[PDB]
C-alpha cells in the first residue's frame, strides 16, 4: 500500500458496474480510489522524463581573453586595422582616441583605435530541446491485499508509458485486472521551454527568456561564439592603449535567475535520462475488472491478536496489523461502531475482505472511522478485539 | 606646457601681480594659470597614492563543499546527532522530516534530521583598512618657458603633498619660484571605507556595505569562516535524505555591485602602494616670486622659420614652433591681427614672452586668437611669417 | 475488600443478562463491581508507567566557565580572532572597545575584541520522549471473599498489562475466574510531551515548552551544547579586558515553571520504570465465570461474636468482623431490617454470601444499610447479634 507513505493522499469514491472513474496525479501525491465492491486501488506517479534531448544552444558564463593587441592611427591617417579583426575567435572593438602632440601626432583631432582579444569559453550551460511528444511517464499501482510493509517493495506494479502509448492493463494475481487511461498530453505542454543544464545541476526554463539572455552563446557543435561583447569590457581608450578585461564568472547571477524554475535531475545511471518534476497527469480507472479474493471462505473464530495497534496516518485513516495464530484461511471480520453493541458498522473499510493466506498469517487493515469517538472492532465474536478510537 | 596635450583644460587669471590664486585639480584635467606680467604655470594632479594598508576581512565568493554527512532519527526516538557539528568548519543544518510506517518507524510523526559538510574557500576578496595618515598627493607643475615637447618631461617638477608637507616650493631655472598649497585634509573621506581587492582589480568600498554583504567571511588573520549559511543551501528533506548544494561563484554579482565604486590600481613595483583613480584636491598658487627670463633682451629682426605650423588644439589656442637662426639673445614678436596692417593686437599670448637664447633655439609659442578671421604674425619687416586663422 | 481502604469509591451494578460491565478506573479512585447473583469485585488502577523512555535532550540549569581567554586589536589593525573560536566547546562573543593612548594603542577609536570561555554543565535536566505504544499499566482485582484486612495483600491478584496484552484472566480459588479487557489508556492527556527529570524529581511537560526553554541543550548522544549564550554573561569591554560570568543556577526558576506539571515518579528497584500519574484506564469486566462458594452449606446457629463492631466507612456502607466459634462450616445469615420483626433484608449485602470455613474463622461483612433507621442483624433467634445503624 504505497499510498500510506505519501502525505498528499486523495480519496476518490466510485460506482458499480462497467464504469470508469476519473483521477489526476502529481509527482508528489497519491490517490486511493474506492468503489462499492471492488478492492480499492492505489495510484501514484514515479517519474516524468525525457531521454536524450537534442542540443540547441550553449551559453557561456566564464571566459578567458588569452591575448590582446592594439592598432592606432593619427587623426588624419585614417582608420586603423588588425588582421585579427576578421578571425572568428577574436572579440574586437573600434573606437576613437584623443590624439595630439603629447601623444606623438602632428594634429589634435580624434584618432582611431582597434582592440582585439582571443576569446575562450571556460564553462558554459548546455541548453537541450524537449520534444513534447517524446516525454516518458511511469505510474505505480497497488491493491490493498493486506500485505505487510516489508512486502510492498515487491507487490508494487510499475506501468510504463510514453506520450504515444495507449491505456494499459495491470494484472493482480487472484484479484483480476485493471486498466488505466492516462492522457498525459493534456497535462503537460512544456513546448516553448527547454532544459538548461549546468555542471551537476539542471532546470527547465522558457525559450524566449533564454534567447533574451545577455550572455554570449554558441549555435551548435563548434563554430564561433555569437555575442562575445556581453562578457568583455573595453575601457575608454587612452592615447594608444585600451585595457580589455573579462567580466568574471557569471555562474552566481545565472543561478539567481533560475531559482524560480522547475527542477530537472539527471539520472545517476541511465545517464542520458533527464527526470522532470512538477508535471501532472489525468487518468481514468477501469475498476470494473477487479474482483475480491476468497469471498466464500469461512469467517474467523480463533483468538486473534494485534501485531500493531491502530495508528493515525494523518489521512484520516487508521492502519492496523493483526494475526490469526492457528486458523484455516479464514476471513478476518472488522467493523467500526458507536458502541460495544456494534449493532451496525458505521465506518468505511479500505481493506475490503482481509484473509489469512496461511495458518500463521499476519495481515494489514486500514479503516476510515467517523468523526467523534468510535470503537474499532476486529474479530466479531466472543473473543473480540477493540480499540477506542477518536478522530 | 603639458596641458597642451590634456583634453580637459581650464584657464584661470590672477587679478594682478600674481598676488594669490586658487584652483581645483582633478585627475583627468589640468589648469593653466595666467597673470598680467608673469610666466604661465601648468598644474595637474598626477596620482593619489595610499601606502601600506592592513587586512581587515576576507570575503569568500566561491566555496567548494565536501564530504557531506547525514544522520536521521525515527519520528519519536529523540533528536539527531553528528560529531562533525563540534567542528567550526562544517556548515551543519538541523531540521525535521516526514516519516511513517513505510519508512522505518512505528509512528507517523516527524523525524529529526541533521546534515554537515566542510566549507572550503576556493576564492576570496581582501578588504583593507586605509591609513589616512599615509595619503600622498602628487602634483605636476611646469612653466610655459617655450620648451619643445621632447623636453616637457624633463622640465616638469613633481611635488608630493603628504599630510605634513602642506606647502611646497616649485623652483625653475631663471624664472624664479612658485609656492603651492594643496588642501589634502578636505580632499577625500577615506575613514569610512576599505580597499576591496580581487585578483588584479580593486575598489574603495563603504565599510557598512562591505560588512552588510550577505556573503561568508573570515577575520583578517585567518581562523574561522563565520557566516557559511550564505553560500550553502539545503533542499527540503525527503524521508531519509537531505541534499546540500553549493551556491555558485558570485564573482560576477559582486563586481556588479561594485559598478559604482572608485577604482584603485595596485603598483607594479612597491607591492603596497595603491593609486586611487578620480580624486581631486583644492590648491592655491603664489605667483609673486616668478619672473620673466628675458624682458631685458632685444627684439628679433631676422629670418625666422616655422618648424611646426600653428595647429588647433581643441582649447582654441594655436601652438607653433619658431626657429631663430640668427640673433640669439632676442625676443620674438608675436601678434594676432585682423589685417596684415597689424593695427591692433587681438590675441592673448599664453607663452607670455617668447625669448630665444641660442642661435638655433626652437621655441614653442601658444596664442589665443580671436573669433573670426585673423592673421598670426610672427617677426618684423620683410622676413615676417604670416598665417591665416579661423576661430 | 480493599475498596474499603480507598476513599474515592464508586459502586457499579450488573443486570441479570450477564452482559459485560464497563468501568472507569482512575489512579486515585477505586470501583466495587456488584453482580446481581455473584460475588462483588474490587477493581482499581495501581500504576501507569513507561519502561525505559528514549533519551532526547539534556538541558543545562547550572553551568561553570572553567577557562577564559581574550584577544584585542587596535582600531586600524584589523579584526581579532582566537583559536578557541574554531573549537566547539567554547562560548564566544565579539564586540569593540574604545582604545587610545591610555591603553597602549596608537590611534584613538573603537577596536575589535573577542572573548571565549569553556562551557561545562554541572547539572542538566534530562528530557525523555514518551511513546504511547510503550505505556504499561497494572490493575488490582479482589473479590469480597470476606477475608481479614490483614490478609488482603496475600490474596489480591495483581494483573499486568501492556499495549498488546489484549485481555487477562483473574482466577480466584473456588469462586472461579473473571476476565478484564481494557484500553491501555484512555489518557490522551499525555500526548506531545516529555518526561522531565531533575535529581529525584520528575514532571511531564509540553514539547513546545521544553524546546523553547531559553537554556542551553544537547541531544542524548552527547553533542556539544547548542545555545550557550543563555548562561554566559559578557561584561562590556574595558581596555583589553572582558569579564565573563556564569548566569546563576536556574533550578528554582525551572521548578517554578514545572509546578503545574503532572508528577512522575521513578521506581526504586527497576530504575528505568517511570510511573506516570494522572491517567484514565477504561475496562470491561466479565462477571459470568464467577461463583458463590458455599450456597449449599448449613446456616449458622451457634452464638457468634463481634471482633470489630460495625463501623462507618464513609461510602455509606458499614463494616463489621464476626467470629464463628463453633459449627463453623456454615453460612452467616446477615440482614438489615426496619425493626426486630425482621421482615426483610431491606439492605444490600456487598459480601453477598458470607461463609465461615474453619472452626474458629473470623469473617468480614460489608452492608449497605437503607436510609433512615435500621437494625443490622446477624444470626438466628435467641442468638442474634444486633446493632442500631442510622443512614
Author numbering:
A (entry chain A), B (entry chain B), C (entry chain C): 1 to 391
What text comes from the article?
Yellow fever virus (YFV) is a re-emerging flavivirus that causes severe hepatic disease and mortality in humans. Crystallographic studies have resolved the structure of the YFV E protein and shown that its domain architecture is similar to related flaviviruses, with three N-terminal ectodomains, known as domains I (DI), II (DII) and III (DIII) and a stem anchor region known as the transmembrane domain (TM). Here we use a chimeric virus platform to resolve the first high resolution cryo-EM structures of YFV. Stark differences in particle morphology and homogeneity are observed between vaccine and virulent strains of YFV, and these are found to have significant implications on antibody recognition and neutralisation.
Introduction of R380 into bYFVES504 also resulted in more homogenous virions, allowing for its ASU to be resolved to a high resolution. The symmetry expanded local reconstruction method was used to resolve the ASU of bYFVES504 T380R to an initial resolution of 3.2 Å. To help elucidate all particle stabilising interactions that might be mediated by T380R, the symmetry expanded map was further refined after a focussed 3D classification around the previously ill-defined icosahedral three-fold axis. This resulted in two final maps with the three-fold axis E protein in two discrete states, which we designated up and down. While the global resolution of these maps are similar to the previous, the three-fold axis E protein is well resolved in the down map, allowing accurate modelling of the E protein in all three positions. Residue R380, which is located on a non-surface exposed loop of E-DIII, makes contacts with neighbouring E proteins at three unique inter-raft interfaces. The five-fold axis E protein R380 residue makes two intermolecular bonds with the backbone carbonyl groups of D382 and R384 and the two-fold axis E protein R380 residue forms a salt bridge with E87. In the down conformation, the three-fold axis E protein R380 residue makes a bond with the side chain hydroxyl of T133, while this contact is not observed in the up position. The atomic model of the bYFVES504 T380R ASU was then compared with the atomic model of the bYFVES504/DIII17D ASU and was found to be highly similar (rigid body whole ASU Cα RMSD: 0.82 Å). Instead, we propose that the three inter-raft interactions mediated by R380 act together to lock the smooth mature virion structure, and that this conformational stabilisation propagates down to the dimer level.
